[PDB]
Amino acid sequence: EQNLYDVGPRDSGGREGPGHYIAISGNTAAGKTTLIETLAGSLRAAGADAVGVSERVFHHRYLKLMFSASADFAFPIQLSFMLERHLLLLDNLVRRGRTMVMERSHLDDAMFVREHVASGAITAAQQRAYTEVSGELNARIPNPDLIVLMNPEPELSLERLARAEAEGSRPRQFPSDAAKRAWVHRWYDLYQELHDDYRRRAVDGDLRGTELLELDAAASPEEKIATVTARARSLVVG
Amino acid sequence: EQNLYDVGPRDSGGREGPGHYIAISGNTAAGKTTLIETLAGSLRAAGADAVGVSERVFHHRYLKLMFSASADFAFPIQLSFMLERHLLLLDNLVRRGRTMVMERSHLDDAMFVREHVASGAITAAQQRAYTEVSGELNARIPNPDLIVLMNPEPELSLERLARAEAEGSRPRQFPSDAAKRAWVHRWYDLYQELHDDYRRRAVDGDLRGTELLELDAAASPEEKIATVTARARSLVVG
Numbered sequence: 001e002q003n004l005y006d007v008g009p010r011d012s013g014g015r016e017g018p019g020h021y022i023a024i025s026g027n028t029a030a031g032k033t034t035l036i037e038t039l040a041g042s043l044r045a046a047g048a049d050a051v052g053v054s055e056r057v058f059h060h061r062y063l064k065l066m067f068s069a070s071a072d073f074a075f076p077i078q079l080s081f082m083l084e085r086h087l088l089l090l091d092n093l094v095r096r097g098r099t100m101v102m103e104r105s106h107l108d109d110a111m112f113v114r115e116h117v118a119s120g121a122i123t124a125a126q127q128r129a130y131t132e133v134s135g136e137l138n139a140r141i142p143n144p145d146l147i148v149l150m151n152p153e154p155e156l157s158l159e160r161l162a163r164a165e166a167e168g169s170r171p172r173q174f175p176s177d178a179a180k181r182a183w184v185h186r187w188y189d190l191y192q193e194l195h196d197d198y199r200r201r202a203v204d205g206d207l208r209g210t211e212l213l214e215l216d217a218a219a220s221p222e223e224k225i226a227t228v229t230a231r232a233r234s235l236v237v238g
Numbered sequence: 239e240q241n242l243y244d245v246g247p248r249d250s251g252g253r254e255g256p257g258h259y260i261a262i263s264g265n266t267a268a269g270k271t272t273l274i275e276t277l278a279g280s281l282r283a284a285g286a287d288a289v290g291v292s293e294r295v296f297h298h299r300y301l302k303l304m305f306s307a308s309a310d311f312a313f314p315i316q317l318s319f320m321l322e323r324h325l326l327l328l329d330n331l332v333r334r335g336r337t338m339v340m341e342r343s344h345l346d347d348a349m350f351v352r353e354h355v356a357s358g359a360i361t362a363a364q365q366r367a368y369t370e371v372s373g374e375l376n377a378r379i380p381n382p383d384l385i386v387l388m389n390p391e392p393e394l395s396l397e398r399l400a401r402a403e404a405e406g407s408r409p410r411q412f413p414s415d416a417a418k419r420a421w422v423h424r425w426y427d428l429y430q431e432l433h434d435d436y437r438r439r440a441v442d443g444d445l446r447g448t449e450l451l452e453l454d455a456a457a458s459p460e461e462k463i464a465t466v467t468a469r470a471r472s473l474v475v476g
């Protein structure tokens with residue numbers, strides 16, 4: 001529908017360079033999909049060649065093995081998340097000049113490798129190889145232009161996940177109820193640290209040209225849309 | 239059909255460990271698909287949980303951009319070939335104990351990065367990052383047990399490719415007739431060197447427990463099947 005995998009030539013009129021790049025940053029079941037789909041449609045209405053990319057686009061067929069056999073599959077499935085996200089951005093954002101609304105940016109994947117390194121599922125040597133490739137890939141992708149910091153509390157994530165799994169609107173990704181609870185909590189803690197890093201790197205680090213926006217994951221979806229649209233509308237190019 | 243992406247539990251009876259691993263090694267349009275599909279069916283008939291994997295399984299949606307925009311897409315598309323092959327082997331051969339008949343083994347992908355490094359499409363720094371990840375991935379996969387060296391001459395490859403493209407039985411992967419001709423020739427030269435390396439490493443290197451089998455890419459498909467089956471039938475486990 002959104003022409004995400006077109007290997008044909010760029011069609012951006014007279015506008016040169018990459019499109020613009022909006023990303024949500026937060027733990028699972030933060031309430032992202034209504035937001036990013038609405039934003040992509042409103043940016044298109046303003047004349048932007050914009051697309052919204054749900055993270056489910058990047059779910060490998062083998063995703064569940066990351067969580068049921070993590071010391072075997074966490075390293076290559078983490079490579080898959082960063083590689084497939086990279087390729088989609090390199091083609092759509094950079095090569096074809098389109099504007100992206102992402103449920104997760106290329107800057108967030110490293111924290112998921114950190115989680116598996118701490119648990120022991122990914123070795124230090126695997127992490128070093130990952131980081132070498134990640135640095136080369138990320139150097140070819142512009143920083144996100146607007147990052148929405150939206151980290152849900154763990155019990156909110158788990159309530160939303162439980163309802164979605166019960167009604168069959170998403171699959172059961174974890175090997176046990178406790179594995180789901182534990183990964184959600186470990187990711188929550190890492191995301192709190194990552195967002196504090198973001199606040200620093202937007203002032204004294206590599207993101208001084210990027211806008212950060214804080215957003216409560218428990219806010220109503222209409223409030224989320226209104227808050228993020230007020231900043232995203234400014235980024236429209238034809 | 240062959241249950242290649244099953245994240246459910248192993249079902250191998252009392253047999254432990256990985257399955258066995260047969261790979262063809264040669265340039266494009268060597269005449270591989272009839273061979274590997276016939277071999278997988280005959281191994282299954284003998285009671286092996288065997289599968290044949292065509293290389294088209296690993297073609298990324300963005301494959302054509304490797305060849306039309308190589309200095310942007312050769313590095314990540316080469317990462318995709320080795321990552322997707324790795325995951326399929328890690329699940330089917332190792333985790334689930336199945337026997338594989340592959341159109342290309344995990345040992346051959348590095349030569350395709352070498353081609354792009356020589357041309358300048360992949361930088362030396364990108365190649366080093368690739369090699370770091372490749373070493374970690376390959377350390378988790380058994381060597382192939384039987385490698386069939388089948389490298390076609392370039393004009394034979396190009397005649398077969400031209401007929402397949404003309405009748406629509408495969409897509410036109412290259413941006414020009416000359417790009418197709420040139421990549422086929424550069425790969426041919428690299429494969430001749432790779433096969434000479436293979437002959438050494440099966441005696442004095444890391445493949446002393448692997449069988450090599452020479453096969454003319456211009457031989458009739460019935461001769462190919464008979465020659466390879468005479469060695470592959472020995473590798474059947476129930």
Ligand SMILES: Nc1ccn([C@@H]2S[C@](CO)(OP(=O)(O)OP(=O)(O)O)[C@@H](O)[C@H]2O)c(=O)n1
Pocket residue numbers: 027028029030031032055056078081082103104108109112173187
């Ligand atoms: N590098 C990464 C990126 C994502 N994930 C999983 S993939 C997942 C599935 O639910 O999250 P989603 O991004 O798809 O969004 P959602 O749950 O809020 O709807 C969730 O388990 C993430 O931790 C991961 O392990 N490694």
Ligand SMILES: Nc1ccn([C@@H]2S[C@](CO)(OP(=O)(O)OP(=O)(O)O)[C@@H](O)[C@H]2O)c(=O)n1
Pocket residue numbers: 265266267268269270293294316319320341342346347350411425
């Ligand atoms: N690491 C790799 C592996 C494969 N290829 C391409 S993918 C291709 C498409 O035709 O070959 P196939 O393996 O799919 O088999 P075939 O042509 O004989 O039918 C051919 O261009 C290969 O060089 C590549 O660039 N990098």
